[PDB]
Amino acid sequence: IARTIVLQESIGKGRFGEVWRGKWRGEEVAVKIFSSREERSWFREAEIYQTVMLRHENILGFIAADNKDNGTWTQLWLVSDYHEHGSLFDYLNRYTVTVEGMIKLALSTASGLAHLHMEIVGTQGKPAIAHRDLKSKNILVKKNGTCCIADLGLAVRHDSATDTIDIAPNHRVGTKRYMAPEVLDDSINMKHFESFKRADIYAMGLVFWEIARRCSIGGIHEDYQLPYYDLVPSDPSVEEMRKVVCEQKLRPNIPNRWQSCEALRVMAKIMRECWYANGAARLTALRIKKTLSQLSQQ
Numbered sequence: 323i324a325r326t327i328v329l330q331e332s333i334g335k336g337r338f339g340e341v342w343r344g345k346w347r348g349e350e351v352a353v354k355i356f357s358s359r360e361e362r363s364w365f366r367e368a369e370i371y372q373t374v375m376l377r378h379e380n381i382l383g384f385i386a387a388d389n390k391d392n393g394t395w396t397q398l399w400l401v402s403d404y405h406e407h408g409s410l411f412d413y414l415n416r417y418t419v420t421v422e423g424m425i426k427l428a429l430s431t432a433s434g435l436a437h438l439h440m441e442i443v444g445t446q447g448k449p450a451i452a453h454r455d456l457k458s459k460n461i462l463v464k465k466n467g468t469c470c471i472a473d474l475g476l477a478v479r480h481d482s483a484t485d486t487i488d489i490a491p492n493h494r495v496g497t498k499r500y501m502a503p504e505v506l507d508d509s510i511n512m513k514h515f516e517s518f519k520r521a522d523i524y525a526m527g528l529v530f531w532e533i534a535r536r537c538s539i540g541g542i543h544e545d546y547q548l549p550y551y552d553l554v555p556s557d558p559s560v561e562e563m564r565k566v567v568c569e570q571k572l573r574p575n576i577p578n579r580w581q582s583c584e585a586l587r588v589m590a591k592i593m594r595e596c597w598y599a600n601g602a603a604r605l606t607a608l609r610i611k612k613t614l615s616q617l618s619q620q
């Protein structure tokens with residue numbers, strides 16, 4: 323693995339470590355590199371990606387975890403598939419999409435989240451998994467115009483037999499802008515795994531809003547914005563978010579334009595039904611997938 327990979331170009335720094343474009347036997351791969359003092363972050367992400375039966379077309383393709391000693395210090399590596407478009411955030415900043423394109427991005431995202439969330443029962447069993455930091459910067463766009471989900475480092479895994487979670491969750495681990503109301507106000511019951519699934523759904527609703535803005539019909543579309551761009555600072559605090567989302571009870575604005583088009587009407591209805599304050603009221607990822615699959619056929 324690491325011995326035979328050559329780093330070519332720095333992509334960016336995430337929560338911990340740095341992502342690079344590298345070449346393995348001539349083929350582009352992505353490499354996330356951590357220092358020795360970040361071993362816990364590296365290990366936990368490696369552990370999630372090595373979950374039995376995890377691989378899926380809408381989850382980032384994991385190749386290997388490894389160590390590389392350069393002669394002075396040790397680097398801890400994760401290696402994955404490389405996607406030239408990069409993140410959905412980058413993609414939506416650079417491009418507009420068609421109705422077809424929008425549905426493909428939304429459906430693929432929902433399909434990946436439904437797979438994450440779904441327990442697969444059997445001898446080779448997959449636990450249900452919640453992401454805890456879903457956002458457009460953590461979703462990649464493939465050449466074929468579908469998405470796959472990345473940064474599984476903060477994920478939690480469910481044991482169905484006991485209704486327990488594999489780690490002891492801390493409060494408010496993810497990106498503040500995308501935190502669900504119950505995460506912002508700390509009312510979430512973090513002994514209840516379903517609560518983490520429901521919080522992911524709220525975040526996916528925000529991502530859908532980002533996509534729909536860029537859906538261009540007759541040359542008409544909105545400019546790229548992050549959710550709540552109109553209400554909070556860049557790099558918002560929990561308190562700034564809580565005042566908007568919990569107290570004033572605002573959600574991203576749904577433009578009037580989105581009523582002129584069946585696909586955009588279906589997307590807008592999904593968003594509203596991801597954004598309820600009470601997590602139990604929100605749609606499931608499986609139900610969103612079904613709705614978009616049917617829309618995708620019509």
Ligand SMILES: Cc1cccc(-c2[nH]c(CNc3ccccc3F)nc2-c2ccc3ncnn3c2)n1
Nearest residue numbers: 334335336352353354400402404405408459472473
């Ligand atoms: C497990 C693993 C290995 C290698 C990269 C990633 C990964 N982890 C994130 C998380 N997000 C992220 C990170 C840094 C900076 C900023 C961000 F938003 N992205 C990528 C990724 C993978 C493949 C790819 N191809 C083109 N870019 N690219 C990015 N994971």
